[PDB]
Design a protein around this ligand. Structure first.
Ligand code: BEF
Ligand SMILES: [Mg+2]
Ligand SMILES: [Mg+2]
Length: 220
């Protein structure tokens, strides 16, 4: 049986997307750029901070220096960090706490494999830290998703090979990173985004220990 589960954070454990959206919208309002609404924000999901800022500048054909660019990106981040201060246990997605409890009770390792530089903070705010055996630090990997680095790191940190692990992800790049690590992906979302060659569940309430076991046994 699998020995570890490698969890992404955003779209698996909780949603930070609302806060990202609000942070960008506030920045755009401050600098006078129209058009940063919820529909536009879909173009920012899974996009780097710098590429997201550039998309917003492009709305106004706005040109800035490297130092101005850096400062704007910083201000967005400051907005975001302020906005996540009220994250709480109520923000944990359905099924996730029970899964964490059941993994722990069965001595299956639990690791975070998130791109978030606020991962430890967010897990503390949600009261989840006690379930995690390790958090892979995204600042210490050489390459971001879809590179496998973060999943390799997460598995190794809990003393397992990726081949002994399941990865849980909501993004295409995440799924590719799990695949390339050697771990078994189980997506949450739709195959249009994630691919049709992996198991996908419609929402996190389907991530149960019994389901993970079923998936692992079918893989063999
Ligand atoms: F937290 Be993951 F990188 F969406
Ligand atoms: Mg995610
Ligand atoms: Mg690039």
């Amino acid at each position: 049986m699998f020995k570890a589960v490698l969890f992404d954070l955003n779209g698996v454990i909780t949603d930070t997307a609302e806060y990202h959206f609000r942070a960008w919208k506030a920045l755009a309002e401050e600098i006078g750029i129209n058009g940063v609404d919820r529909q536009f924000n879909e173009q920012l999901k899974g996009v780097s901070r710098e590429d997201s800022l550039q998309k917003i500048l492009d709305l106004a054909d706005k040109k800035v220096s490297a130092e101005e660019f850096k400062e704007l990106a910083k201000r967005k981040n400051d907005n975001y960090v302020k906005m996540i201060q009220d994250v709480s246990p109520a923000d944990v997605y359905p099924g996730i706490l029970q899964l964490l409890k059941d993994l722990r009770s069965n001595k299956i390792k639990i690791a975070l494999a998130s791109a978030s530089k606020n991962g430890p903070f967010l897990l503390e705010r949600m009261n989840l830290t006690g379930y995690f055996d390790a958090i892979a630090d995204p600042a210490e990997v050489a390459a971001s998703k879809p590179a496998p680095d973060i999943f390799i790191a997460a598995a190794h940190a809990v003393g397992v090979a990726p081949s002994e692990s399941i990865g849980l992800e909501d993004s295409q790049a995440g799924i590719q990173a799990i695949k390339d690590s050697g771990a078994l992906p189980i997506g949450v979302g739709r195959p249009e985004d994630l691919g049709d060659d992996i198991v996908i569940v419609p929402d996190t309430s389907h991530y149960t220990l019994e389901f993970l076991k079923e998936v692992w046994l079918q893989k063999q």
